[PDB]
Every structure is written in C-alpha cells, then in structure tokens.
Amino acid sequence: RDNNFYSVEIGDSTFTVLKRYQNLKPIGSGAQGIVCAAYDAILERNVAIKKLSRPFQNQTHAKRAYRELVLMKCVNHKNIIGLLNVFTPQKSLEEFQDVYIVMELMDANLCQVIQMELDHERMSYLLYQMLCGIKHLHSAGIIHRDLKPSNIVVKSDCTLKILDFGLATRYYRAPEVILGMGYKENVDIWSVGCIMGEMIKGGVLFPGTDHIDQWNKVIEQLGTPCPEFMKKLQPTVRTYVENRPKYAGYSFEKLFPDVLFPADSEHNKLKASQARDLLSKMLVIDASKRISVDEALQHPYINVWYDPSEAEAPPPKIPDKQLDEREHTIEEWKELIYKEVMDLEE
Amino acid sequence: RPSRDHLYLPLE
Numbered sequence: 404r405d406n407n408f409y410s411v412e413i414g415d416s417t418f419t420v421l422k423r424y425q426n427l428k429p430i431g432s433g434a435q436g437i438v439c440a441a442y443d444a445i446l447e448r449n450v451a452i453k454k455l456s457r458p459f460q461n462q463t464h465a466k467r468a469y470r471e472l473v474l475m476k477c478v479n480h481k482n483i484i485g486l487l488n489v490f491t492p493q494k495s496l497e498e499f500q501d502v503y504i505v506m507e508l509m510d511a512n513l514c515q516v517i518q519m520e521l522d523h524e525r526m527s528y529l530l531y532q533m534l535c536g537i538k539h540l541h542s543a544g545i546i547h548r549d550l551k552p553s554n555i556v557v558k559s560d561c562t563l564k565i566l567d568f569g570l571a572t573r574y575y576r577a578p579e580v581i582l583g584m585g586y587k588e589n590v591d592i593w594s595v596g597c598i599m600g601e602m603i604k605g606g607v608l609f610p611g612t613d614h615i616d617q618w619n620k621v622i623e624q625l626g627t628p629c630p631e632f633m634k635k636l637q638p639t640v641r642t643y644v645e646n647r648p649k650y651a652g653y654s655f656e657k658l659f660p661d662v663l664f665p666a667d668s669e670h671n672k673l674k675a676s677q678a679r680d681l682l683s684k685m686l687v688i689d690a691s692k693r694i695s696v697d698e699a700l701q702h703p704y705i706n707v708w709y710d711p712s713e714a715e716a717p718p719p720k721i722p723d724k725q726l727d728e729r730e731h732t733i734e735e736w737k738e739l740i741y742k743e744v745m746d747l748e749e
Numbered sequence: 750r751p752s753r754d755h756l757y758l759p760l761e
C-alpha cells in the first residue's frame with residue numbers, strides 16, 4: 404500500500420500524501436497544524452490539504468475531529484467548505500497515526516479581506532454568502548457559536564466559505580455565550596454583526612483579553628442591557644452585570660458615523676444607512692430583540708443577491724445522530740475515526 | 750438579478 408504515498412517536509416512537519424497531490428506549499432496555519440496547497444493530478448485542479456496529527460489523542464481532539472469528518476462529508480453547500488478526499492498513510496489500525504483532509508482551495512481568510520479596500524457591492528455579497536452558509540447549518544441543527552474571520556475563507560472571485568462547524572480568547576462570541584446563558588440560532592448573528600462592523604471600521608469591535616474584559620467592552624459601547632436581561636442571568640452571573648458601572652453606550656450613528664462610508668452618489672448614502680441599520684439589528688445584546696438569519700437575508704442591504712437555490716437549500720442528511728454527544732475511550736475513538744477515514748476515501 | 754461576474758478581491 405505504501406507505494407501510493409510520498410513524503411515532503413513542510414517547515415517542521417512531514418506531509419506523507421498520495422502521489423496525486425503535487426507541489427505542496429504552506430498556505431496558512433493554526434491549532435490543528437499547517438495547511439498546504441497542492442495540485443491534484445487526478446482532478447486536475449488545486450486543492451487544500453490539512454494534516455490532523457493524532458486526532459485521537461484524548462477525548463476533545465477525537466470528538467472534534469470525528470464530528471468534522473462526518474459533517475463535512477454529509478454537508479454539501481457552496482458556502483460551506485467541501486470535503487474532496489480524506490486518507491491516512493498508515494496501513495492498519497495499530498500503526499494508524501494521522502488523518503489528511505483534502506478540501507477545495509481558497510485564496511485567503513477574512514482577516515486579509517478586512518485590511519483591504521471594499522465597497523457595498525462586495526461587502527453585501529460576502530455577508531450574503533455568510534448568511535447562506537449559516538442558514539444551511541442551522542437547517543440541520545448545527546449552531547456554530549464560534550464564527551471568526553480566521554475560519555472564514557474567500558476566493559478572488561469574491562466567493563466565500565465557512566471552514567468549520569463551530570462548537571458541539573473570543574472577540575466574536577455573543578454576549579449570551581460569555582455569560583453562560585441559553586442561546587438560539589441568532590447567536591451566530593452576533594458573530595456576523597461583529598465581523599461586518601469589523602470590516603467597516605477596519606479593527607476589532609471588542610478586543611478583550613479574557614471573559615471579564617470582553618463583556619465590559621460590549622456594555623461600554625452598546626450600553627448596559629435592560630432590566631429585562633440582567634435578571635435572565637443565573638443568580639451567580641446576574642451578580643456581575645448588576646455590579647459594574649452602568650453606561651449609556653452610543654447610537655449606531657456614533658459607532659458607525661456617516662464618514663465611514665462613501666457618501667457621493669445618492670444611492671451610496673442609501674446603502675450607508677441600510678448597512679448601519681442591519682448592524683443595529685445584529686449587534687443587539689439581548690438575543691431576543693436580535694434579528695434572525697431568515698430576516699437578515701430579507702434585509703434590503705443583503706437581499707439584492709438572493710437566490711433560492713442557495714439561500715433555501717435542502718438541509719444536510721446527518722446520518723450519525725448520537726454525533727456530538729457520544730463518549731468513548733481513546734481506543735474506541737481511534738477505531739471510529741479510522742473507520743470513518745477508510746469508508747470516506749474515494 | 751445583479752451580476753456577480755465582475756466581483757473581484759485582489760488576493761491572487
């Protein structure tokens with residue numbers, strides 16, 4: 404079996420990959436290691452390759468990796484990153500060490516897009532695409548909770564995909580999350596509010612070092628939440644919110660002043676007000692007053708790009724159910740993951 | 750529906 408693989412060094416690590424993947428180059432990095440570009444000689448297109456080193460070394464790693472495999476396999480939507488291939492170089496359960504995930508290749512993450520010149524056309528489209536992908540996830544009960552610019556990728560044609568499937572420091576986490584409260588689908592709409600806002604102002608809306616500093620920077624801006632929210636926190640946490648200085652915050656006029664948008668064409672102040680509006684529907688601390696995914700898609704700023712084939716797609720059929728709520732021994736995870744890698748390879 | 754063909758991000 405070993406005749407099918409070759410190895411190349413990528414910085415520190417060794418990528419042992421099927422011979423169909425040629426010319427690996429590093430395209431980015433993160434927790435789960437380095438990610439490469441490659442040329443797939445079979446499909447005759449460029450692809451992306453992610454190496455998972457011992458996805459089964461401990462419960463957290465295994466649970467996360469297994470879920471991602473299964474979900475990436477069964478989900479098929481243009482705004483969610485698609486699985487092209489998955490393989491392992493080791494030739495038996497015992498030797499089994501590593502998992503390689505082969506994806507569609509994109510050009511950059513959202514961090515770069517923010518440090519970059521934009522307009523309403525492209526901004527509205529990027530936001531429209533994010534919403535589509537989210538809606539799709541929600542339609543299968545996947546609620547992300549952890550959307551950030553680094554896990555969202557774009558292509559030069561301005562197309563966008565979400566790199567991962569969220570939870571089963573954090574600037575973009577919704578207030579209802581930093582405060583250990585209940586959440587619904589629109590918890591992800593907070594994240595999208597932060598990202599939008601961040602594109603506009605060029606910099607992070609709420610840069611806290613921990614959970615404490617994070618929350619304060621939110622009330623400082625939008626103001627202390629209503630009495631109807633501060634007593635929605637469990638006794639312990641409802642103690643903090645009614646224990647720190649109370650601010651009035653700013654209007655979304657002061658947070659996102661006219662000067663931040665192009666105000667030439669009559670229709671460019673139109674878009675400017677439309678954009679400001681959506682932000683205020685999204686960055687609502689109280690997750691009950693907050694706009695929903697279906698609502699945003701309808702909002703005038705966004706809906707110009709509406710297409711039912713992409714905004715209203717059939718939900719994924721996730722065939723594992725117990726998925727993201729099962730517990731196994733490390734040895735059982737190794738089996739599950741290996742099994743799933745073997746079954747999913749083309 | 751407006752065209753998405755010309756939309757470009759200088760990333761290449």
Ligand SMILES: Nc1ncnc2c1ncn2[C@@H]1O[C@H](COP(=O)(O)OP(=O)(O)NP(=O)(O)O)[C@@H](O)[C@H]1O
Nearest residue numbers: 431432433434435438451506507508509512553554
């Ligand atoms: N399919 C891809 N196409 C283009 N770039 C990618 C792709 N996958 C990953 N990247 C890049 O590699 C970086 C690493 O992200 P990723 O490997 O998905 O993990 P992450 O966002 O760092 N953290 P985590 O998901 O916990 O491992 C991304 O920010 C992208 O810049």
